[PDB]
Design a protein around this ligand. Sequence first.
Ligand SMILES: [Zn+2]
Lengths: 108, 96, 81, 83, 362, 94
Amino acid sequence: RAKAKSRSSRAGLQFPVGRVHRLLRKGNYAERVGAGAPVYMAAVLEYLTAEILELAGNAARDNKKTRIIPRHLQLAIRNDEELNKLLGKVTIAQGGVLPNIQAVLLPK
Amino acid sequence: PHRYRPGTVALREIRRYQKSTELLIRKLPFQRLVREIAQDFKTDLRFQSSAVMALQEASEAYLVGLFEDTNLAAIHAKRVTIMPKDIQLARRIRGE
Amino acid sequence: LRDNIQGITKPAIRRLARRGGVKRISGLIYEETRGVLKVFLENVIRDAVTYTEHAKRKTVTAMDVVYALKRQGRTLYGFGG
Amino acid sequence: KVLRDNIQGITKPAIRRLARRGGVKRISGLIYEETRGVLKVFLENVIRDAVTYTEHAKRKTVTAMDVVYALKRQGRTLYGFGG
Amino acid sequence: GASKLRAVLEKLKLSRDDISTAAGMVKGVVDHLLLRLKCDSAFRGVGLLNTGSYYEHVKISAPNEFDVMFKLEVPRIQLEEYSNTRAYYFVKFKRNPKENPLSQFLEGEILSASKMLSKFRKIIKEEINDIKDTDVIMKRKRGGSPAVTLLISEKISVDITLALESKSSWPASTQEGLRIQNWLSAKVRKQLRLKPFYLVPKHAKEGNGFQEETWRLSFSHIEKEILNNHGKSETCCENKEEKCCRKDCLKLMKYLLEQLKERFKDKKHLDKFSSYHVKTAFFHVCTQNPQDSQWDRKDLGLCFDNCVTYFLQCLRTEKLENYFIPEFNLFSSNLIDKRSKEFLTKQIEYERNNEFPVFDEF
Amino acid sequence: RSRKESYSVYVYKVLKQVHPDTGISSKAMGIMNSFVNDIFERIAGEASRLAHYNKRSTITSREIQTAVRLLLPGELAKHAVSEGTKAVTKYTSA
Ligand SMILES: [Zn+2]
């Protein structure tokens, strides 16, 4: 038998490809899953994951940390307008809120 | 007899509570509130501790978002103090 | 196990208001707030019970709460999902 | 040919009539412009999705269903034009 | 061998006690300039890197020569290495939804070093003409490391460097840099790397030409932190019980090079050498000699001699790794010709065999 | 024992590319897992509809692509499309 090779490595991805291929056939979403479907999707999930982690990582650095906590994810998501929206209905456990104080409440 | 003026502390608390992530509602009280509501649907019902927390965080998140809109309504009305009606307006606009 | 809405202390209410950016709170807010919180909880808990019942269980799990919240335009992250 | 400034195609009486249906009694002069800038966003979002659906299907002509899906996606359903 | 060196070091420090007024004039000019830059849409976010100071002296024997950096934040950048240079990159911006005001300096995808430097000096030029109490003249720019050189009356010069600030994790090419693990500790290294890194407009200098829109990595802020935290004890030298000669050796090394450069400024052999080369070699010697006891102040004479030897070795072998960018050879034949290195080697060896007379002669 | 699946291992790896020197709490990881499952379902869900609407039994890279455009807003949607389009182009070329 020819040597088996992981597909994630092959597609230049870190996210699993065969599995996504699989998951796309579940929940009864479509009878069949095309070969490029999970490849396309795995790239998307990985991309979005990176964007959140990068921004959260920057938040971690802003707070002089060596890691991401739920709070950093919240700050990252909200500061980034497009992620803010993508997850605009999402409640993050222990996310807190942005420190937005209305100007009319402040003295001179 | 040093004092900090009205609004100095209020702003301070706002700063802090916006910053922190912890639950603001006492737990045993909240837990019991959940149960009292639950018993109106069904007696002898149980909860995982994680379920209660999940409810509490969602509950606080809801109220905070509500208060943000309430605050805006009060400001629109040229007022700092929020009144029951400002809550009602915000809710209504939201479809409640 | 009655009127446990009063277990939501006044400071607890004010602190949430503060987090929301509220600087001043009318004396009639406490009660009005409760009348809203309660409805929120009623809607979420009940769905969780409905899911729990469907599944033929007695213990409400975090997942049943998540489904209840989810469908109201509120995905909650942290308890599984 | 290219079109332009049809935002003005939404005439002042048209805006007022909508406002009136909504229970608005009295309208500030700046509402007209402010309203258009909001209507426009709504239209942009719906039309775009309808186009996106249309393109996915590899068609050129937008049908009622493409609009219906677009509106459903934004969460405002519409009955009587398909479903 | 330490006594003569100590007299020199004391002398060099004391020559700066007169500076406070010169520093004042520099500050006057800098604050003035920052106001204009803040008025400019491109530099609206500009500020000093070395916060709390309007002065930083690169040359130990030039107390009237000042060096300041004006930093400008770049909220997200993508670096692209230029032609395997390892230290030079093109700067592009990542996805950014809102308007990025530095867009005016873009050329295609790339942030133009040429445009920013050109405009930076143009802004300062117009603004210095609004300095009324101090006479400030601008020099014509030649390179890109100092964006602007200002001439204050007939005594003071100020080199102004513009730098982009990035708060992202440092590029992988820096992964093995800041080689302080065996000297100042791995934990200090980790702490420093949680800090931002900088990019300075810099054409990719190479064998017979250069790239116009490249930016070079800069860790000047770390270098400052190291010089003032050169010990693994980290408070070594802030107390006489723990007084080492690392700082003293570097000043003497800088002084040796500066004195020789002044001595031979006319023969031009040494024009391309700078304190940064000395300092880079120095950090490496500190890395080679990580214990404070290898730098006991009592041993300044031999410590300095050993520092000199390492520097000579670097010149002779044409190798001096950037301390932060180990694949960047500061002493590559592409940046400095062999003749200059042989000359400096020879001059230093002469000085050293005669107990460094150039330290006294001027 | 029963066994559970997550993306924890893949999340770590991504974190390393953006921030090679940082880690992540167990909670942040739990959140990222909730996140991935949410996005997956939506895209797959919308892709399901597109296949249905256009009378198909199969989801291909296009249904995934269109679902992305409909779900993601502005430019974020684009990079996802670019990467997906490529990953398929590449997968069959790798
Ligand atoms: Zn020391």
